[PDB]
Structure formats: C-alpha cells, structure tokens
Design a protein around this ligand. Structure first.
Ligand SMILES: *[C@@H]1O[C@H](CO[C@@H]2O[C@@H](C)[C@@H](O)[C@@H](O)[C@@H]2O)[C@@H](O[C@@H]2O[C@H](CO)[C@@H](O[C@@H]3O[C@H](CO)[C@@H](O)[C@H](O)[C@@H]3O)[C@H](O)[C@H]2NC(C)=O)[C@H](O)[C@H]1NC(C)=O
Ligand SMILES: *[C@@H]1O[C@H](CO)[C@@H](O[C@@H]2O[C@H](CO)[C@@H](O[C@@H]3O[C@H](CO)[C@@H](O)[C@H](O)[C@@H]3O)[C@H](O)[C@H]2NC(C)=O)[C@H](O)[C@H]1NC(C)=O
Ligand SMILES: *[C@@H]1O[C@H](CO)[C@@H](O[C@@H]2O[C@H](CO)[C@@H](O[C@@H]3O[C@H](CO)[C@@H](O)[C@H](O)[C@@H]3O)[C@H](O)[C@H]2NC(C)=O)[C@H](O)[C@H]1NC(C)=O
Ligand SMILES: *[C@@H]1O[C@H](CO[C@@H]2O[C@@H](C)[C@@H](O)[C@@H](O)[C@@H]2O)[C@@H](O[C@@H]2O[C@H](CO)[C@@H](O)[C@H](O)[C@H]2NC(C)=O)[C@H](O)[C@H]1NC(C)=O
Ligand SMILES: *[C@@H]1O[C@H](CO[C@@H]2O[C@@H](C)[C@@H](O)[C@@H](O)[C@@H]2O)[C@@H](O[C@@H]2O[C@H](CO)[C@@H](O)[C@H](O)[C@H]2NC(C)=O)[C@H](O)[C@H]1NC(C)=O
Ligand SMILES: *[C@@H]1O[C@H](CO[C@@H]2O[C@@H](C)[C@@H](O)[C@@H](O)[C@@H]2O)[C@@H](O[C@@H]2O[C@H](CO)[C@@H](O)[C@H](O)[C@H]2NC(C)=O)[C@H](O)[C@H]1NC(C)=O
Ligand SMILES: *[C@@H]1O[C@H](CO)[C@@H](O[C@@H]2O[C@H](CO)[C@@H](O)[C@H](O)[C@H]2NC(C)=O)[C@H](O)[C@H]1NC(C)=O
Ligand SMILES: CCCCC/C=C\C/C=C\CCCCCCCC(=O)O
Ligand SMILES: CCCCC/C=C\C/C=C\CCCCCCCC(=O)O
Ligand SMILES: *[C@@H]1O[C@H](CO)[C@@H](O)[C@H](O)[C@H]1NC(C)=O
Ligand SMILES: *[C@@H]1O[C@H](CO)[C@@H](O)[C@H](O)[C@H]1NC(C)=O
Ligand SMILES: *[C@@H]1O[C@H](CO)[C@@H](O)[C@H](O)[C@H]1NC(C)=O
Ligand SMILES: *[C@@H]1O[C@H](CO)[C@@H](O)[C@H](O)[C@H]1NC(C)=O
Lengths: 290, 48, 289, 48
C-alpha cells in the first residue's frame, strides 16, 4: 500500500551551478573534425540547478515542474535513484509515464496511474535485498509499455564518496519524449562536479502526453519493519532554454566541447567567428540587445 | 590567407539553404519529383 | 560518367502489415487516437490496390512517385475515425474542433494522410454513437499530443459538476447513420509519419539490391539516398544511431552499408583541371590538351 | 463548433490559426446559395 514518511525535513532547494553540462547530440548525422552551429533547447552554461538529497531525515521527492524539458543529474554510490514519473496532474485524471529500474529490468509504462504521494522502492541493509514496494495504486488506460532485457542491479548501501554521476536530458516535443543519457565516474563528496559530457540519444518514446510536472523515484532503507531510513544520494535539476550552441566534433566524431553563444560577449564573438581560439584585439559584436 | 579564406568560405557556403528545404542536392532529388525538385533546385542555383 | 548501378537496401523479407493497419477490425476515436510502430518490412503498397480505395491521399515532405525508391525511418501509423466534413481538418495549419482539441499535425509534418469512406461498416440504420471527439477544452492541443481525460468543463475554468448550469461534459458522440449525407458519414484516417534520409531505416521500398562495387564511378542508391560517386572503404567509426556522414559542405561523404555494416566513403567522379591549346580554328582544327 | 459543420472553409490573406489573435477592419458578410458543383467557383481566378 501507499506509505507516508512522517517528520521529514522540508527540501532545502539548495542552488548550484551547471558548469558546461547538459550538451547532447542534436541529430543522427556523423560529423568529425568540425565546428557545428545549432540552435535548440540547451541547458545554458553555468545556470542555476536545484539540489535534492536523501540523507538522514531528508527524503526529497517533491513534484517539480517540467517547463520546456529538463537536465537531471544524479550523484550516488548505492543506486538510490531508480526513475521518474512524468505527467501533468500527477494523479489518475491524466496520462502519466513511469520510467524505472526495478533492479532486474528497465520498465517504461504510460497509463492512468493512481500515483502514491510518496512512491519509493525498499532495500534492506541486512542482506541487500529489495522488497516489493508501491509506486502506484492502480492503472487502467495503458497506451505504451516497454520492458528491456534482464540484468542485475547492485543493491546495498556503500561507503565513501559519491562515485557515479548519471546525467539525463528529457525533452517533450511533437508527441515524443526524447531521453538522452550519459555516465561519468566521480569522487565527489557533495555538489555537482564541474565538467563536460555529451549525452547520447537512448530513447525517443512515442507517448503523446502533456508533461508539466515530474517526481523522482528513490529507494528507502528501513532499519526496522515499521520505521523508515535513508542512504546518502543527491540529484540536481536544471531547465532547458532555446539558445544557440557551437559544438566541436573531434576525429572520432564525438562531441568533446561546446560554446554557449549567449553566455557573455566573448562567447558571442567565438560563435560569430566560428572558432574556440580568438586572437588579441578588439572585435565588433552584436548591438546591445534587451 | 585572403585567397585561401575566400576559397574555403566558398566551399562552406554550399551548406547554406537559400530558402530551400535542404542544401543537399541528392536529398532533394531523392525525395521530390521533377517539378518540386525544380523549384528547390532553382532556389539553390540562385543562391550558389 | 557512371557505367554501373549499385543499390544497397537492408535484409528485409516480410511485407509491411498493410492488412493489420488499413484492414483492422476496429478503429479508435479521434480524441483517443492510437499510434502503431512499423519496422523491418517492405512497403510494397501496390498490394493495397486490390483491396483499398482512398478518397483522400496527400503526402507532405515527399513526392508520391518516389515512395517506391526510398527507405523510411521511425515509421508510425496513427489511426482514427472522423466525420466527412472533418477530414479536411487532418492537415497542417488547420483550425476547427478536431484540429484544436483532438488531433493536431505539426507545421513541418513529413508523411502522408490517407482517408477513406467507411459508411458501410462504421454506420448503422439505428445510428452508431461509439466514436467521440472532444468539443470543449481550455486551450489547443500541441502537435501529435493526446488528451484522453474526461473531467467536467466550465468556461470559467473552475472545478465543475455536471448538474450545474455552467457545467458540460467535454466529449461529444458522432452520430453516424446510414441515411446521413456525405459530410456526416464516417471516414477512417491513417496518418503515416516518418523521417527519410537522415537516420537508420528498417522499412524499405520494393527494390532489388545489387553487389557492392568499389573504386569505380557508379550510380548508387543507399537506403533511398541516390547519387553518383566512387565508393571506398572507410576508417570512420559510426555510432549505432548514425547512418550517414556529412562534411563541412553538407555533402553526404560517408555511409554505413545496410547489409555488411561496413563504413564506405563516397567521392565525386569528376575531378581535375583541363585546358585546351589551339593555334586558331581558321589556321587549324588540331588542338593540344 | 457546436452548431455549424462546414464542408468548405478556405481563408485568403490570413492563416486560419491566427484568427483568434487579430482584430478585423471593415468586416462584411456576403451570403447566398449555389449548387454543389458551383461551390468551387466561389474563389479568386475562377471561370464559369
Ligand atoms: C482515482 O484515484 C482516486 C484517489 O485519489 C487519487 O489518488 C490519491 C492516492 C491521491 O494521489 C489523489 O490526489 C488522487 O486524486 C480514487 O478515489 C478514491 O477511491 C477509493 C476507492 O473507491 C475511495 O476509498 C473509499 O472512500 C470512502 C471513505 O473515504 C469509502 O467509500 C470507502 O471506505 C473507501 O475508503 C476513496 O475515498 C476515493 N478518494 C480518494 C481521495 O482516495 C478514484 O476512484 C480513482 N479513479 C479510478 C480508479 O477510476
Ligand atoms: C480511461 O479509463 C476510463 C475509466 O475506466 C474509461 O472510461 C470507461 O470507459 C468504459 C468503456 O467505454 C465505460 O463503460 C461503458 O460506459 C457506458 C455506461 O453508460 C456504456 O457505454 C457501457 O454500458 C459501459 O459501462 C465506463 O463507463 C467508463 N468509465 C468511466 C468512469 O468513465 C475510458 O474509456 C478510458 N479511456 C481510454 C481512451 O481508453
Ligand atoms: C497540460 O495540462 C495542464 C494541467 O491540466 C494544463 O494547464 C492548464 O491550462 C489551462 C489553459 O491555459 C488553464 O485554464 C485556464 O487558466 C486561466 C485561469 O487560471 C484562464 O486562462 C482560464 O480561465 C482557464 O482556467 C489551467 O488553469 C491550467 N491548469 C494548470 C493546473 O496549470 C495545460 O494547458 C496542458 N497543456 C497542453 C499543451 O495541453
Ligand atoms: C541562483 O540562485 C542563487 C541563490 O543561491 C543561493 O545559494 C545556494 C548555495 C543556496 O543556499 C540557495 O538556497 C541560495 O539562494 C541566486 O543568487 C542570488 O539571487 C538573488 C535573487 O535573484 C539575487 O538578488 C542575488 O543578488 C543573488 N546573489 C547571491 C550572492 O545570492 C541567483 O541569482 C540565482 N540565479 C538566477 C539566474 O536566478
Ligand atoms: C578516438 O581516436 C583516438 C585517436 O584520435 C585522437 O584521439 C581522439 C581521442 C581525439 O582527440 C582525436 O581528435 C585525436 O586525433 C584513439 O586514441 C587511441 O586509441 C587506442 C585504441 O584504438 C588506444 O590504445 C590509445 O591509447 C589511444 N590514444 C592515442 C593517443 O592514440 C581512440 O582509441 C579513439 N576512441 C575509441 C577507439 O574509442
Ligand atoms: C544480409 O544477408 C547477406 C546475405 O547472406 C544471406 O545469404 C544470401 C545468399 C541471401 O539469402 C541473403 O538474404 C542472406 O542474408 C549477408 O551478407 C554476407 O556478407 C557478405 C559480404 O560481406 C555477402 O556477400 C555474403 O553473401 C554474406 N555472407 C554470409 C551471410 O555468411 C549480410 O551479412 C546480411 N546482413 C545482415 C545485417 O543480416
Ligand atoms: C521488473 O519488472 C519486470 C517487468 O514487469 C518483471 O518481469 C516481468 O514479471 C511479470 C510478473 O511476474 C511477468 O509476467 C513478465 O513476463 C516479466 N517480464 C519480463 C521478465 O520481461 C520483473 O520481475 C521485475 N523485477 C523485479 C520486480 O524485481
Ligand atoms: C462574425 C461574422 C463575421 C466574421 C468575424 C470577423 C472576422 C473573421 C472571423 C472568423 C472566421 C472563421 C469563422 C468560423 C469558421 C471556422 C470554424 C470551423 O472550422 O468550424
Ligand atoms: C472544344 C474542345 C477542345 C477545347 C477547345 C480549345 C481549348 C481549350 C478551351 C476551353 C477550355 C474550357 C472548357 C470548358 C470548361 C469551363 C466551363 C465551366 O467551368 O463550366
Ligand atoms: C534477505 O533478507 C530478507 C528480509 O528478511 C529475507 O526475506 C530474505 O530471505 C533474505 N535472503 C535472500 C533474499 O536471499
Ligand atoms: C480484412 O481482411 C479480411 C480477411 O482477409 C477480408 O475478408 C476483408 O475483406 C478485409 N477487410 C474488408 C473491409 O473487407
Ligand atoms: C484481387 O482480388 C480479387 C478479388 O478477391 C481476387 O480474385 C484476385 O486474385 C486478387 N488479385 C491479387 C493479385 O491479389
Ligand atoms: C452544445 O449543443 C448541445 C446540443 O444542443 C447542448 O446540449 C450543449 O449544452 C451545447 N453546449 C454549449 C457549450 O453551448
């Protein structure tokens, strides 16, 4: 059934910077050793990202607005974050889509979900075994269903710093939920590590759903059969905006760098001259725009 | 450098649509029949 | 000048499910339109000639006469039923109840719209009310988006209960009778959507592949992309989601073979400067080159 | 939407999707009846 965690500290909504993260492949065309200018919905460099953590009394799984697509980063070491729910009303009045790893398969289901206000998986620290839990109470109008090949997720709390940075970009357009993903090894104690990592397309789901809000799916670690606990994990959310980027394709055809043309006058000059290197001097740029 | 840059920008300008659906002649001729292809190719010819 | 022809389509053996799509036993309502993915098949649509007659057939982004020579990426079929008068609304840039609240096509739609009269099976003497459409909504749908919610609607945009005077249920039932006029008769609509020459494809036209010829000027057709050039083995490493490669000029300079998965570089046939030396046509007709 | 179903609806000089965001000057409505075959004739450049 749907269980509620009581005496939870409210989310702090701490703010951090995105650095140069969030770039993904704009199309399916192979390019190499080239600078490519493209206008699309990108996460602007050094934009505000809101952090949500699971630690101690914090179980941060609020409803977060979708806006025009999001960038979602997860820093973890024990696979706490398992998926997302995307929808509009976040109840059984409208269609919703759940994307989740249930420790043996990747499941994507679009239906009328009677979503639980506090949906989570359950993992027992005693022997690192996941117990059946509830993400939704019912579902009747499923329009899309997908289950991936079987695997085995490594359950159980682990010590040390956050080791895995998993990045995703979600964009709803023309009846398609585009999901780009990427992985990175890190050794960060807290915060969003600075860096660059191009995200590759992994899904283009034909959902045809009105998506305005989403809620992350996490796993709780109950110490006793009637009490709830948490393991350390963090995730960060940022918002995409329409903007122009100059991407760099290297010899193997991988995006290794990008310039955000709207960040500052220097970036605008770089995008105008189509080069990452500018010589010494004075250059005319765009007239002051408001 | 001026000579080389003029030639290289001439090469790069081939990627610019000139109001046509695409800058790739083969793509146009593969998707469109004689008449609509003629319209798009006329735009490209004017531009180039 | 090219002397040989190379045609390379992927290994496809089955016919596309024309009978499952265009000859399905039931069709959805337009508000609850259903989408179906199509992959790994031959789109030999001439088989439809013997079974289906289409009142409306309109293609966007592609010429009707090129369909037999192409391969299609991300092929989807959207199926539903509308009124005859409403068929005109299934097209980009339209307005009306259907295009506003039920089914919206993108401005840059690539694909085709097929509609055919279905009076005999979808209409009854008593009147068939199974098909529905949304008549009220706070704002218009986005392209290819669906809204199957059924909540009471109030023009003031506040919670609603059916009995109230300013309260309406937002779904209306088409009434299809046999004796109805042509504008009030049921029409089945299938919208096929796809991309053409920028990504891997598994649906291909009924064409015959030939052997791969290399180091010779040929007329090539790779997955529907036609051209003239010389094909050579390539050192490029394409990702699984990449099918074509382009240079700074946007010219298609590489391609993955649909059958062997080999990466091949494409080069122009024509190359090299030529000049003619003449002493004057009046003096002689002999020239050096 | 609730009362009238239109077999023909064609707009010139303006896109149908922008009508809700405009104000119209010197609006006139001409009304008449014709044959079905003749409806196609109600359009610029027609003969008959
Ligand atoms: C859609 O879901 C609602 C419940 O509300 C939805 O789910 C919640 C968990 C939250 O996320 C809400 O924001 C969300 O809208 C269903 O309505 C509920 O149905 C149940 C089962 O019939 C009702 O339980 C009964 O209620 C009374 C006592 O309260 C007695 O009849 C019974 O003893 C029994 O408890 C419940 O009251 C009702 N309302 C709520 C708020 O839960 C709704 O049926 C469902 N629609 C479907 C399945 O089509
Ligand atoms: C989304 O789910 C809802 C809820 O299940 C579906 O609505 C239900 O649809 C069924 C099938 O049409 C209805 O049953 C029929 O309803 C009327 C009753 O007068 C009548 O046609 C039949 O006797 C039969 O009972 C059912 O009432 C209805 N339920 C509710 C609560 O509205 C809906 O169809 C689903 N939507 C889609 C797009 O699948
Ligand atoms: C996706 O779903 C959401 C949630 O259902 C839709 O948001 C809703 O949008 C409508 C129309 O804009 C809003 O109704 C109108 O709002 C104001 C008053 O608030 C006014 O214009 C009208 O009186 C009317 O009430 C509605 O409030 C709003 N709901 C929420 C919860 O934000 C959204 O439109 C849907 N998107 C698409 C593309 O269909
Ligand atoms: C991005 O957010 C910051 C605020 O983040 C603060 O620091 C975080 C570490 C965390 O503790 C957050 O909860 C804090 O709020 C904004 O910085 C300030 O924003 C206000 C409001 O606009 C502005 O008046 C101040 O000048 C800003 N400067 C400082 C030093 O706080 C920042 O503006 C946000 N960015 C955008 C684009 O809105
Ligand atoms: C990617 O290609 C490189 C060689 O290209 C250079 O390095 C790229 C990363 C990029 O910066 C290009 O612009 C450069 O021109 C490969 O690098 C070697 O790969 C081999 C295995 O194939 C490995 O043993 C070597 O250590 C690598 N390093 C060097 C200096 O050669 C690289 O493997 C390619 N990536 C692959 C194959 O995944
Ligand atoms: C596509 O199939 C070809 C051909 O192999 C099969 O046998 C043929 C006689 C015919 O029945 C085909 O439809 C079958 O698929 C495969 O081509 C292989 O590769 C070489 C060239 O490298 C080709 O000349 C050989 O005939 C084939 N050799 C084999 C099959 O051992 C090709 O690999 C298949 N591609 C895919 C993606 O399945
Ligand atoms: C994760 O979800 C998958 C998909 O639902 C589960 O595998 C399915 O289990 C159901 C119920 O027993 C079977 O009917 C399906 O045939 C299974 N589908 C497969 C294997 O593709 C899987 O058991 C779940 N893992 C958990 C809950 O740990
Ligand atoms: C009020 C009469 C005079 C016209 C008002 C002024 C300007 C033009 C306004 C609207 C034109 C569209 C009329 C309705 C047809 C579309 C509805 C449908 O597709 O069903
Ligand atoms: C006389 C037969 C050969 C044609 C004569 C030569 C040239 C073409 C001339 C006329 C074409 C129009 C024919 C009538 C159709 C329009 C009348 C209508 O809209 O009702
Ligand atoms: C792991 O612990 C759970 C909880 O007590 C128990 O049910 C299970 O049998 C244990 N062993 C496993 C899952 O191998
Ligand atoms: C659909 O297929 C069946 C079985 O082959 C065939 O009899 C029928 O004619 C087809 N559809 C229609 C509308 O006739
Ligand atoms: C076309 O359909 C008719 C009528 O059923 C049938 O006799 C004929 O064999 C069919 N032809 C082909 C080529 O399928
Ligand atoms: C639309 O017309 C129907 C049929 O007369 C009526 O019941 C309904 O109230 C009308 N709706 C509106 C919004 O005027």
């Amino acid at each position: 059934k749907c269980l509620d965690f009581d005496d939870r500290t409210p989310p702090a909504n701490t703010q951090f910077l995105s650095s140069h993260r969030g770039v993904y492949y704009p199309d399916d065309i192979f390019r190499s050793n080239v600078l490519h200018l493209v206008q699309d919905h990108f996460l602007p460099f050094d934009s505000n990202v809101t952090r949500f953590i699971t630690f101690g009394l914090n179980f941060d799984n609020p409803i977060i607005p979708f806006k025009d697509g999001i960038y979602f980063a997860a820093t973890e070491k024990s696979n706490v974050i398992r998926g997302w729910v995307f929808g509009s009303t976040m109840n059984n009045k409208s269609q919703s889509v759940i994307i989740m790893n249930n420790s043996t398969n990747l499941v994507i289901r679009a239906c009328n979900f009677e979503l639980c206000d506090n949906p989570f998986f359950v993992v027992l620290k005693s022997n690192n075994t996941q117990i059946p839990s509830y993400i939704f109470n019912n579902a009747f109008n499923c329009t899309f269903e997908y289950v991936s090949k079987d695997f085995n997720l490594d359950l159980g709390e682990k010590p040390g710093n956050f080791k895995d940075l998993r990045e995703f970009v979600f964009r709803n357009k023309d009846g398609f939920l585009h999901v780009y993903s990427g992985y990175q090894p890190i050794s960060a104690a807290s915060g969003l590590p600075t860096g660059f990592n191009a995200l590759k397309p992994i899904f283009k789901l034909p959902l045809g759903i009105n998506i305005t809000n989403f809620r992350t799916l996490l796993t709780a670690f109950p110490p006793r059969p009637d009490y709830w606990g948490t393991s350390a994990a963090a995730y960060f959310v940022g918002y995409l905006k329409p903007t122009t980027f100059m991407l760099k394709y290297d010899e193997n055809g991988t995006i290794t760098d990008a310039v955000d043309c709207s960040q500052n006058p220097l970036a605008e000059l770089k995008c105008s001259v189509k080069s990452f290197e500018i010589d010494k001097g004075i250059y005319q740029t765009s007239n002051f725009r408001v | 450098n001026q000579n080389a840059q003029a030639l290289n920008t001439l090469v790069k300008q081939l990627s610019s649509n000139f109001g046509a659906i695409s800058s790739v002649l083969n793509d146009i001729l593969s998707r469109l029949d004689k008449v609509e292809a003629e319209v798009q190719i006329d735009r490209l010819i004017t531009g180039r | 000048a090219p002397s040989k022809e190379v045609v390379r389509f992927p290994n496809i053996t089955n016919l596309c499910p024309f009978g499952e799509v265009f000859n399905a036993t039931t069709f959805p309502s337009v508000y609850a339109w259903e989408r179906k993915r199509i992959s790994n098949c031959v789109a030999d649509y001439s088989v439809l000639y013997n079974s289906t007659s289409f009142s409306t057939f309109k293609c966007y982004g592609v010429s009707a006469t090129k369909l037999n020579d192409l391969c299609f990426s991300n092929v989807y079929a959207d199926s539903f039923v509308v009124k005859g008068d409403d068929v005109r609304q299934i097209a980009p840039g339209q307005t009306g109840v259907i295009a506003d609240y039920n089914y919206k096509l993108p401005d840059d739609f690539t694909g085709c719209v097929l509609a055919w009269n279905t009076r005999n099976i979808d209409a009854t003497q008593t009147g068939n009310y199974n098909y529905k459409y949304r008549s009220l909504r706070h704002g218009k749908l986005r392209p290819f988006e669906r809204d199957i919610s059924n909540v009471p609607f109030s023009p003031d945009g506040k919670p609603c209960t059916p009995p109230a005077f300013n309260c309406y249920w937002p779904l209306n039932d088409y009434g299809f009778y046999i004796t109805n006029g042509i504008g009030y008769q049921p029409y089945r609509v299938v919208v096929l959507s796809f991309e053409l020459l920028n990504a891997p494809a598994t649906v291909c036209g009924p064409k015959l592949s030939t052997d791969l010829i290399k180091n010779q000027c040929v007329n090539f057709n790779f997955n529907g992309l036609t051209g003239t050039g010389v094909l050579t083995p390539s050192s490029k490493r394409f990702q699984p989601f990449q099918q074509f490669g382009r240079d700074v000029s946007d010219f298609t300079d590489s391609v993955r073979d649909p059958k062997t998965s080999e990466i091949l570089d494409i080069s122009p046939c024509s190359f090299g400067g030529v000049s003619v030396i003449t002493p004057g046509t009046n003096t002689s007709s002999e020239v050096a080159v």
